[PDB]
Amino acid sequence: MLKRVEIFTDGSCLGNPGPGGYGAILRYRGREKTFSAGYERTTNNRMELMAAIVALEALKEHCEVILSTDSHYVRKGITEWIHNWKKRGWKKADKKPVKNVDLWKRLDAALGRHKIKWEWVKGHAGHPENERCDELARAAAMNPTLEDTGY
């Protein structure tokens, strides 16, 4: 049996664009590791991606990951858009790079390192870990310390 890990994420900004943060919880054998950081200026969607990136990258080895997140953007990106972005060389109609290509590629790179099983959440209600990520993200966004160089 391969290591089984649970990851919960959430990201948000105060206004959009605006100060933002991400919150993620990694659970393995009952133990829960928390991750959070705030940026001076970014977007809601970039933070949603960042939360998943940071948590996944913390895995030092290949695992079976159960990712739980509430994000229409990430869901649409992973389940539909991404297949077309790759087919089109990550370039949009104006012949410029797809938005957030930097984070999308970083996330794809992280995803490919494990066996992922996405669980799309519709409202944090009934999902305590995700609510915790939401508060973790908001707390970081209110006390930023990083710059989103990619933004």
The three-state (H, E, C) secondary structure of the chain, written as one string: CCCEEEEEEEEEECCCCEEEEEEEEEEECCEEEEEEEEEEEECHHHHHHHHHHHHHHCCCCCCEEEEEECCHHHHHHHHHHHHHHHHCCCECCCCCECCCHHHHHHHHHHHCCCEEEEEECCCCCCCHHHHHHHHHHHHHHCCCCECCCCC
- Is the bond into 19 cis (omega within 30 degrees of 0)? no
| Distance of alpha carbon 36 from alpha carbon 50, whole angstroms | 10
How do the domains of the chain map onto residue ranges? 1-151
Annotated active-site residue in 20, 21, 48, 129: 48
Q: Do 19 and 39 form a contact (C-beta atoms < 8 A)?
A: yes
| Distance of alpha carbon 48 from alpha carbon 132, whole angstroms | 14
| Distance of alpha carbon 110 from alpha carbon 119, whole angstroms | 17
Tell me which method was used to determine the 3D structure.
X-ray
| Distance of alpha carbon 51 from alpha carbon 96, whole angstroms | 25
Which residue ranges are tagged as binding site for Mg(2+)?
Answer: 10, 48, 70, 134
Q: Interhelix angle for 101-111 vs 44-57, to 10°?
A: 30
Topology given in CATH for the domain delimited by 1-151? Nucleotidyltransferase; domain 5 (3.30.420)
> What's this structure's resolution in Å?
2.0
Does residue 48 have an active-site annotation? yes
Start-to-end Cα distance in the chain: 40
Does residue 112 have an active-site annotation? no
125: number of Cβ within 10 Å: 9
29: number of Cβ within 10 Å: 7
User: Which pair of structure tokens corresponds to residue 79?
Assistant: 């389940």
Contacts of 93 (CB under 8 A, 6+ apart): none
Annotated active-site residue in 38, 70, 114, 127: 70
Does residue 11 have an active-site annotation? yes
Does residue 148 have an active-site annotation? no
User: To the nearest 10°, the Cα dihedral for 11, 6, 53, 78?
Assistant: -80
Q: Which residue is listed with tokens 């509430």?
A: 70
Does residue 70 have an active-site annotation? yes
Q: Do 100 and 46 form a contact (C-beta atoms < 8 A)?
A: yes
